[PDB]
Write a protein that binds this ligand. Structure first.
Ligand code: BPM
Ligand code: MG
Length: 297
């Protein structure tokens, strides 16, 4: 049971060892397509690639590769597409993926610039009057409105398939204060953000998989997805004790390598799930408390 176990691990100071054991048992599948010479420029990081079995294929006969993986959680009945922050040359592919997979929301857990370095391209419009056209994939993207809060911003975007003139509203959830290889300010800030995404319907089964990304699409992204899935699992059963956090992470790791990058992010996942369990188990008022504690204004 996660809380009891959280106590034992904490008291022993064994987060490093527990996290290392997870890395040790994690799946290892080939990424042949990711490593093809022609795809060199489609990967942000040499050491972070999508397994061939779970990679998202772009619908085109030219080059269908994009550094993105489909994390299909069978038991939880939820899927996510984890991807790297798009590069200057892969922005069109990114939106093509969003279009083809029928995603309703895009969760960004990083900033364009971190530690003096460009960790992701500016793939969405920053101003209403300056829309973006991706010539290669024939898509148009316009900023419709944005709600800026202290540590996150929600944007309403309009994605248009110029070939068919069909349009869709895409919701962009941008967490701007989560340091790479770091953790959110508090479980409250994280849960407040997660519940905003949930609240929007973006994580609902009637839509394609929500797209979740960070710079590499594995650390902060893995943390986000792990907490959400564990919460959904205990929600289905209304039984927090049926959830084995580590087992869940290993299951996700069958779909994309390196999910959750540090022992502290793992520890933070436990905290988020234990705190979130309060809402799942009947205390709906806790949601407004996270909102207050997050100081989003
Ligand atoms: O670049 P460094 O900071 O020097 O060390 C890293 C090396 C590789 C990664 C990605 C990565 C890490 C682990 C991984 O899977 P696993 O070995 O835990 O199974 C898959 C990708 C992240 C950090
Ligand atoms: Mg203006």
């Amino acid at each position: 049971e996660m809380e009891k176990e959280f106590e034992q691990i904490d008291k022993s100071g064994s987060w490093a060892a527990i996290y290392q054991d997870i890395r040790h048992e994690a799946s290892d599948f080939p990424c042949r397509v990711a490593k093809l010479p022609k795809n060199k420029n489609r990967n942000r990081y040499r050491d972070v690639s999508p397994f061939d079995h779970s990679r998202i294929k772009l619908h085109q006969e030219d080059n269908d590769y994009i550094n993105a993986s489909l994390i299909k959680m069978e038991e939880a009945q939820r899927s996510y597409i984890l991807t790297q922050g798009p590069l200057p040359n892969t922005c069109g592919h990114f939106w093509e993926m969003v279009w083809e997979q029928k995603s309703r929301g895009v969760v960004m857990l990083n900033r364009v610039m971190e530690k003096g370095s460009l960790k992701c391209a500016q793939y969405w419009p920053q101003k209403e009057e300056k829309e973006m056209i991706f010539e290669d994939t024939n898509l148009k993207l316009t900023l419709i409105s944005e709600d800026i809060k202290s540590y996150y911003t929600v944007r309403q975007l309009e994605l248009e398939n110029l070939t068919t003139q069909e349009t869709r509203e895409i919701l962009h959830f941008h967490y701007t204060t989560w340091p790479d290889f770091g953790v959110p300010e508090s479980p409250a800030s994280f849960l407040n953000f997660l519940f905003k995404v949930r609240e929007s319907g973006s994580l609902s089964p009637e839509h394609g998989p929500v797209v979740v990304h960070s710079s590499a699409g594995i650390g902060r992204s893995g943390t986000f997805c792990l907490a959400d899935t564990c919460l959904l699992l205990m929600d289905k059963r209304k039984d927090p004790s049926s959830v084995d956090i580590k087992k869940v992470l290993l299951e996700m790791r069958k779909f994309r390598m390196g999910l959750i990058q540090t022992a502290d992010q793992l520890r933070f996942s436990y905290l988020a799930v234990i705190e979130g369990a309060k809402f799942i188990m009947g205390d709906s008022s806790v949601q407004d408390q996270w909102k207050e504690l997050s100081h989003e204004d």
